[PDB]
Symmetry: D2
Subunit: 328 residues, 4 copies
């Protein structure tokens, strides 16, 4: 996997984010997701890889573009790709927090090829955090005690993040009961998980259930940033079990370590769409010296080098023209 592909992936997430931003707060989820899918597919087909989507918009049944198995790329090293063209159920359409475009790449077989089902997740940051510090089968209380001990802080210092959902009431109650502070995001548990390993995020732990593709993407990031994570797939009906069986998953209650989610040489890239607790959103800027432009804020990382690059890009644009020109 050539060292060039890392920086080429940022451009993909950037184009996808600018497309999404044209639809931000337009109250049309479908238009936002389609802008992002279109931009991200068109841009991947300019990347020099022999890519196979292993995590994408769905099965070829359901999704015309970026479907499982889709081959993408102009040609190059053989890589498996994990994609989230636009993170968020409604975030972008309402202008909510933590909207993101996400892309990861691994050597063939480097990702758990997750169906879109729910996944329980627990994650903590820290390059020196040891395996076993978090376990999904331990109580919230014991995981938090171990985290607090390793970080050297009183329990009330710890900021636990989870999604505002009824399914998380118990996590919330138990964490508050043992003294921690528990903040709630409305969506976007890729940002929520990775925040545990980002400087100055104000987030120490992530506990919650969210999308499985998002779990894998976040594990990719933390593979690069340092941290520990445990996840478990959840199945609501028999068709989800069939999807897993077709992907090779038969131990349905397997606990995946972070190394089982993403292994080997990993590249992870994301661009912000709206402001979130990982990356800021796209912004319109006017400057006399340099004119008007959109600003995107992105991050690309690589597990083998451990290199992390934060990127602020200025894309020239005459904002007298319609914003949908940012679509591809």
């Amino acid at each position: 996997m050539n060292r060039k592909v890392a920086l080429e992936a940022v451009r993909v997430t950037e184009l996808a984010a600018l497309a999404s931003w044209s639809q931000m707060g337009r109250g049309d989820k479908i238009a936002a997701d389609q802008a992002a899918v279109d931009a991200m597919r068109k841009a991947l087909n300019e990347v020099d890889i022999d890519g196979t989507v292993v995590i994408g918009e769905g099965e070829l049944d359901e999704a015309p573009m970026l479907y499982i198995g889709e081959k993408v790329g102009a040609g190059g090293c053989e890589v498996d790709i994990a994609l989230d063209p636009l993170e968020g159920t409604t975030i972008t359409s309402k202008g909510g927090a933590n909207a993101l475009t996400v892309l990861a790449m691994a050597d063939k077989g480097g990702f758990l090829n997750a169906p879109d089902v729910y996944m329980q997740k627990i994650a903590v940051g820290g390059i020196n955090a040891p395996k076993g510090i978090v376990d999904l089968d331990d109580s919230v209380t014991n995981n938090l005690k171990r985290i607090a001990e390793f970080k050297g802080v009183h329990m009330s210092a710890l900021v636990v993040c989870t999604m505002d959902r009824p399914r998380h009431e118990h996590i919330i109650k138990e964490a508050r009961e043992c003294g921690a502070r528990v903040i709630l995001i409305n969506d976007g548990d890729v940002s929520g998980v990775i925040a545990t390993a980002t400087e100055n995020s104000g987030i120490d732990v992530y506990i919650g259930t969210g999308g499985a593709p998002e779990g894998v993407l976040a594990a990719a990031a933390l593979k690069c940033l340092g941290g520990q994570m445990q996840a478990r797939l959840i199945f609501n009906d028999e068709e989800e079990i069939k999807r897993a069986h077709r992907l090779g998953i038969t131990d349905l209650n397997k606990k995946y370590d972070i190394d089982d989610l993403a292994s080997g040489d990993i590249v992870f890239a994301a661009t912000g769409v709206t402001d979130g607790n990982m990356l800021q959103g796209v912004k319109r800027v006017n400057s006399t010296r340099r004119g008007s432009y959109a600003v995107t804020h992105s991050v690309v990382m690589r597990s083998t080098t451990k290199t992390v690059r934060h990127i602020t890009a200025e894309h020239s644009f005459d904002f007298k023209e319609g914003i949908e020109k940012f679509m591809s």
Copy 2:
């Protein structure tokens, strides 16, 4: 009003914010609000003013501390004090975005002494924006068209902010219909209004109904930053009309210009509690060089100088100790 008082106010908002943060995401809206009231009252009694609370926690009936008419301060120039010990009590409770501590000061008579009623609000930023660019009795479409022409952008470039509430459904649709992007905040229309005048917020217009104290405080900020705002109090019951004559307000359908909400020599200060559209929240930091501390982010502005100060403060703290040590 001495030049000393401006910088002194930021210490008040900082202490109120640290107190509030100790309660962030504890799910106890009362405990947060009173942590912040108690820190702020103690901190104000060390400020060198002869201050009278004209906007506060309520009337002496309902509020033991920071009630209307309360005298505060160690002694000094006579000023009216408009405060919000915690803008976003529920916010802070769930660690949502846009929670703030806020304090403003004017010479005697400088604020609209707003009762606790609702208030229609429209705001735009820009230090060259003309009086009349926005008006509450015009349609959304005509206001946005004037704003778009004044900023020199296509309508789809504009980002309108409003609170996610049934009462704004019509603003939202109308703004979307005429081509603008409309983003929704869950709470915190002080931040929402002030974002319009803050560099790189990504918010161009605020349109909404919220708390009247909040609109006076936001108007105070905008008087310092540059912008235009129009507001009107709403009275739903006879009791609200009674609070108004008790504060001396009798012209119920008055539309207030920004000069009618905050006039003369105005100081505005605020500190972030959580991350928001205006300020970053409090963060725990560890460094080998200096040890561990809480970092706060604050702004303090004065209208006569137009001086705006961005303040990042590092407050030493051993986080092996209980976070409630930050209280009072």
Copy 3:
């Protein structure tokens, strides 16, 4: 020239900067310059170009690249070998790329330069044959400011004294760098640099490089080559230059599709230098600060990169 090449170029400047930093302030010109060169050549040979060095072991005419579109390469493995070696300000690693024939193929001679930033600056706003006063008056009018607000930048050198005197006399503020007129020129177009204008004589390679950047960021510049010795004249003639007194517009220095990349080695008026950082969460790393830009898209990318490293190991492990 394919929209990859821009993001590939930053990696070249980043690697050369880490290598240069390992030699920072060590007092060894040669060891710095050979760390930088070695890393830049190795990184460039991973870039997908048929590159030919036209300005700049990395000798003029050297072919570099793994293979691709045909491009002219202007390079400064270490702009400020002296600079990195004494730990001075404004040490940068730099790379620019243009389509074939896009750069003035400048001999390594001195060059008079004047430059101002701004996307709407009309050509002729600066001209080397106008007085310093009239240049500055036109610039102050264009920026909408009183003359006393202008900050003019030049190098602290005897040859610049008349510039300095005249600019002060007409009321401007005139600041002096000790070297690094790549960064000095490009600061006129770098926001918040506090530099409005650059006037002075410096290396012609360095002038081409700055022109490539301003072509991307917006601004104007004029230059003229200076020949003090017969050898320099011969070296121009062998490059095809025979109008020794030509004034060059910015477009004559760098034209067409251009990519410019740089990474700071020491802190300077354009970029911060490389820093050792420790964090409890992330561990320890060197931070680089880079910029890369392209004239056809006018896309500008600011890049802060964290390179994980155990600083109990020798710093020369950042060499290539």
Copy 4:
């Protein structure tokens, strides 16, 4: 010493820096020094202290304003004042790096009343640095070995800062010989020393001879930030010895520990004039949203709380008017 004086001091250093900036690069060190002195004097007399200048512009013989012994302030707690209206008059006059305006306050007697003589200095940052880590009679190599051990790094990682002067050749050579990296500043060893305790300075150790007033000022900062320093006055002729006996100093070869230079409850404030390796300089800014303004960057800190505040101030201004209007 009330907490109110800390934030009042920043305004002083801001006013002096703006006045200095009006003279930056004008080639007239006199006019710069005088604009700074005038501004600092006037602003000081608005601060609520009973202040005595113990370090200032000179003796009443040579300096009409801010002379040793001068009383300053509007009235308040009694403090000794150590002033540098303009650290870097020559710096400012050429537009060089590391010009600062500086103000430090302490309880009566808490500064070394430094004479205008040269001072050998060595300094390192870090709150856990033990007294004795640096000593002027140990070799440069042994100081650097202890410092590398304390920072937990290979010697080759250390960055040593000194000034580019003949008198420092042996420092430079020895640091290079034992494997360290050595960066050179042309002037401004207040900033050079304080950078050792400043985040992201890239400077680990300061070693060199410079001004003794400047040594005291930097020691005050390091008492607030964490670090260790040693200093020794040096004397090149009788007039210099007389300067010391006039201030009561008779042990001419005393090695001063940091606690001998500044002790007790210290407030340190500084505003950058030019960009340096501790603070950024004053900049002209034009915003479409906010209009045009001068931005100053300051820091204020206190030794007893260890609170540090970083302050970015935007001073509204029409730059069509002459820059000398920033004078006082």
